[PDB]
């Protein structure tokens, strides 16, 4: 009974440290980085700052963690449920692949992956930040190759703005929970370096809306 | 030409194996066990509850002493508890918050864990300083580590989603042996009492019995209609049980090379995450995604109780070597001891 | 010194009020309207409470504060119902103790209602200005504010009976509450006004913060939030302004016609209690459906 | 995929050659080992609280 009490103090200290760590980690935004192969996700990671990679950074007194699982190459259906509760899902897609083929168009594969992730039973209330990279290449390629290669239903002049807006709508139309979740789109810009600002603003809006939802101010 | 004749030979040999399994099947388990009397309802109440985890619990394991246990949570914590006094003995912070398995060495000196990091982290508890330290970090797998069990104090068997398993020597750090043959992500494994053989289950709806020394596969067992999430070994060492996502458990035999009993119910459609046997092998405790665990009579396939004390998916289930308790851990961040 | 031996007739004659021992049309009219409002308040708040109880989704601090507000409104309705069947002619038979108790019940009930409104505003301001997701529950704070609310209400209700009354200083009595003093009226009015301005400030800060940090990015949340805020504030204003004005006139202006519109103003202040639940439980679709 | 088929066949050959005993004997041995350890299973036969460390 003499030494049996020190275990109680050890347990109390362990619980205090656990509570402190939980309070420290609860105020850290969590982002899941996804995207089909041969995308601009590496560029995003570089702009921010062998199975899974973690990138921690800070912006305007707000800490963010980004988890990349590109080196898994396994059945996603088994481990996708591990990222439940993350603050957002950053989905990267390159437009330049609208005509490239890996057979099949990589754009259709990216759209299938987006439909599988967004409409997943685990991610029913998480927000998605869509990064349509390779804006310059897609703007300079449409001048010769039309968008009809992938989207034959498209009808419009071969211009950057029209085709980009059409692709944005096509990617946003795959969402089914139009009211539970919202999708934030941003065409990546390298010169301005505002991607982190966009992510910060999106996360802030998400948090504010959740708070309003929680205190009866729907 | 070669591919066609090889395919035909494989098909004919599989048919021959089927005919052999059929010929050796003269009766069924239930028919021989109809004379024995049931054991009745098994009522087990929560005797202790463990709190402290701030996120989902993904795995646990009991020690040889049947008193200390371990549990990993997505919060980046691996907690070692004392079941008797529900006192948090150890709390190790992981460099990666993605962990999906735990292992307590039989000697109790080392512990292991792994997950999406694809590394098996061996921690030495009995260090001179008194503060746990990462003893080793086994790498080489090309997928997530699903299960790991300490075969000894220096060797360890691990399974990954790369469709292979690996026996490692902790000291050297290199794969002592590699086991291939599976066509899907291996999700669970179980060691035999003698440690000379071990069975592994994958998402290909098939299990395989591998030998350690020779490094070859002895037998392959089928029958499931979906992935295999858990698997346990019978104490006698001559049979095992497998749990899948199709809401069904199945008992396979080694010598007979055929299934014996199927534990399933029409009212259950949820998946299975963990299964365990009693010290006598009469009972079979299986955790489901219906927020509860079910106790089946191995020799009769009749439910003998229901453990309903969790508000979320039951992720892990374990039984001690003594057989005087059962531990259950769920995504609700709570562990519960029964009887 | 203190005139505890005299009857209620002396107190009512010292002022300009009239006993009216005989029944009258206005008395029956106000009694009917009051009992109607009381049954409405009680039914609505009991429905809110049972809905929060049966449904387990509403097990958060905000819903606990809403349930406490509903209970306070139910208590106010019960106190107003007890005030009926005891006013006008029956007032001629009540003694000092019964009179003080009757007034203190209404006082404590309405103070509890106002304090619950203020606490709801504070909790909303807190929950809006956090920067975390999946925050853990903390019932200690809501329990603490609830007990503080009820203690302050009971204190404001018991104070007038214990020592603070016009029994020992008759020269300065109220014209509507002959036994109560005017200092208590001023204190109550100041408390109400500070609570109201605090609520307004908090909600305005909330609106500004939300607008600023969501302008950079189907239905616009700005319009809905503005509507909710303006409604919450306007109900309070239209339901508690004339009563405060009447108390202020009673304490400040002699020879003012104050004894006329007191009962209507009290009825309006009570109808505030019926408006509160429908105001704080109509946006929530799940709450409405639970009914 | 000649090497893969070769390895698969060479592996299944070892599975084809097994000294399998009748399933009746398997069930008999299972029931025997299950009945010979009945007194040793606490859960199957609840032990008095005096011997349960999880009670007192
Ligand atoms: C005048 C109404 C103001 C609005 C309601 C808020 C009152 C909150 C309480 C504040 C403490 C001081 C209140 C003094 C005025 C209360 C007058 C009153 O509520 O009496 C009830 C009256 O009918 C019946 O009078 P009798 O027929 O003589 O019994």
UniProtKB/Swiss-Prot annotation, chain A:
Region described as G3 motif: 64-73
Location of region: G1 motif: 30-43
Record's bilayer topology term: Peripheral membrane protein; Lipid-anchor
Localisation per UniProt entry: Nucleus; Cytoplasm; Cell membrane; Cytoplasm, Cytoskeleton, Microtubule organizing center, Centrosome
PROSITE patterns listed in its UniProt record: G_ALPHA
Reaction(s) this enzyme catalyzes, per UniProt: GTP + H2O = GDP + phosphate + H(+)
Region (G4 motif) location: 129-136
SMART domains: G_alpha
Keyword Metal-binding: yes
GO CC terms, sorted: cell cortex; centriolar satellite; centrosome; ciliary basal body; cytoplasm; cytosol; Golgi apparatus; heterotrimeric G-protein complex
Keywords linked to the UniProt accession: Cell cycle, Cell division, Cell membrane, Cytoplasm, Cytoskeleton, GTP-binding, Hydrolase, Lipoprotein, Magnesium, Membrane, Metal-binding, Mitosis, Myristate, Nucleotide-binding, Nucleus, Palmitate, Transducer, Transport
Binding site for GTP: 38-43, 68-72, 133-136, 190
Assembly, per entry: Heterotrimeric G proteins are composed of 3 units; alpha, beta and gamma. The alpha chain contains the guanine nucleotide binding site. Part of a spindle orientation complex at least composed of GNAI1, GPSM2 and NUMA1. Identified in complex with the beta subunit GNB1 and the gamma subunit GNG1. Identified in complex with the beta subunit GNB1 and the gamma subunit GNG2. Component of the TAS2R14-GNAI1 complex, consisting of TAS2R14, GNAI1, GNB1 and GNG2; within the complex interacts with TAS2R14; this complex plays a role in the perception of bitterness.
Homology family: Belongs to the G-alpha family. G(i/o/t/z) subfamily.
Native source species: Mus musculus (Mouse)
UniProtKB/Swiss-Prot annotation, chain B:
Residues modified to N-acetylserine: 1
Pfam families per UniProt: WD40_Gbeta (PF25391)
GO cellular component term of the entry, any: heterotrimeric G-protein complex
Positions of modified residues (Phosphohistidine): 265
Record carries keyword Transferase: no
WD repeats: from-to residues: 45-93, 94-139, 140-180, 181-222, 223-266, 267-308, 309-339
Any single GO BP term: cell population proliferation
Residue numbers of Phosphoserine PTMs: 1
Record-level Gene Ontology MF annotations: GTPase activity; GTPase binding; protein-containing complex binding; signaling receptor complex adaptor activity
UniProt-listed SMART domains: WD40 (SM00320)
Database matches in SUPFAM superfamilies: WD40 repeat-like
Keyword annotations of the record: Acetylation, Phosphoprotein, Repeat, Transducer, WD repeat
Changes after translation: Phosphorylation at His-265 by NDKB contributes to G protein activation by increasing the high energetic phosphate transfer onto GDP.
Regions that span the bilayer: none
Subunit structure: G proteins are composed of 3 units, alpha, beta and gamma. The heterodimer formed by GNB1 and GNG2 interacts with ARHGEF5. The heterodimer formed by GNB1 and GNG2 interacts with GRK2. Forms a complex with GNAO1 and GNG3. Interacts with ARHGEF18 and RASD2. Forms complexes with TAS2R14 and G-proteins; these complexes play a role in the perception of bitterness. Component of the TAS2R14-GNAI1 complex, consisting of TAS2R14, GNAI1, GNB1 and GNG2. Component of the TAS2R14-GNAT3 complex, consisting of TAS2R14, GNAT3, GNB1 and GNG2.
Record-stated family: Belongs to the WD repeat G protein beta family.
Protein name: Guanine nucleotide-binding protein G(I)/G(S)/G(T) subunit beta-1
Taxonomy of the source species: Eukaryota, Metazoa, Chordata, Craniata, Vertebrata
UniProtKB/Swiss-Prot annotation, chain C:
Chief localisation class: other
Entry comment describing in which tissues the protein is expressed: Expressed in many adult organs, including brain, heart, colon, small intestine, placenta, prostate, ovary, pancreas, testes, spleen, skeletal muscle, and kidney. Little or no expression in liver, lung, thymus, or peripheral blood leukocytes. Detected in lung fibroblasts from bronchoalveolar fluid from patients with idiopathic pulmonary fibrosis. Detected in bone marrow-derived mesenchymal stem cells.
Residues given in the record as a 1-acyl-sn-glycero-3-phosphate binding sites: 17, 102-107, 188
Gene Ontology BP term (one): neurogenesis
Coiled coil, from the record: none
UniProt GO cellular component terms: cell surface; cytoplasm; dendritic shaft; dendritic spine; endosome; GABA-ergic synapse; glutamatergic synapse; neuronal cell body
Compartments in which it is found: Cell surface; Cell membrane; Endosome
Glycosylation sites: 5, 13
PTM entry text: N-glycosylated.
Top-level lineage group: Eukaryota
Extracellular side, ranges: 86-99, 163-182, 250-263
Topology relative to the membrane: Multi-pass membrane protein
Biological function: Receptor for lysophosphatidic acid (LPA). Plays a role in the reorganization of the actin cytoskeleton, cell migration, differentiation and proliferation, and thereby contributes to the responses to tissue damage and infectious agents. Activates downstream signaling cascades via the G(i)/G(o), G(12)/G(13), and G(q) families of heteromeric G proteins. Signaling inhibits adenylyl cyclase activity and decreases cellular cAMP levels. Signaling triggers an increase of cytoplasmic Ca(2+) levels.
Family: Belongs to the G-protein coupled receptor 1 family.
Section covered of the full-length record: 23 to 322 of 364
From Swiss-Prot, chain D:
Gene name as annotated: GNG2
Cellular localization per UniProt: Cell membrane
Membrane topology: Lipid-anchor
Expression (tissue specificity): Adrenal gland and brain.
Protein name: Guanine nucleotide-binding protein G(I)/G(S)/G(O) subunit gamma-2
Family: Belongs to the G protein gamma family.
Provenance organism: Bos taurus (Bovine)
Function of the molecule: Guanine nucleotide-binding proteins (G proteins) are involved as a modulator or transducer in various transmembrane signaling systems. The beta and gamma chains are required for the GTPase activity, for replacement of GDP by GTP, and for G protein-effector interaction.
Keyword Lipoprotein: yes
Keywords: Acetylation, Cell membrane, Lipoprotein, Membrane, Methylation, Prenylation, Transducer
Subunit text: G proteins are composed of 3 units, alpha, beta and gamma. In this context, interacts with GNB2. The heterodimer formed by GNB1 and GNG2 interacts with ARHGEF5. The heterodimer formed by GNB1 and GNG2 interacts with GRK2. Component of the TAS2R14-GNAI1 complex, consisting of TAS2R14, GNAI1, GNB1 and GNG2. Forms complexes with TAS2R14 and G-proteins; these complexes play a role in the perception of bitterness. Component of the TAS2R14-GNAT3 complex, consisting of TAS2R14, GNAT3, GNB1 and GNG2. Component of the TAS2R14-GNAS2 complex, consisting of TAS2R14, GNAS2, GNB1 and GNG2.
A cellular-component GO term for this protein: plasma membrane
UniProt GO molecular function: G-protein beta-subunit binding; GTPase activity
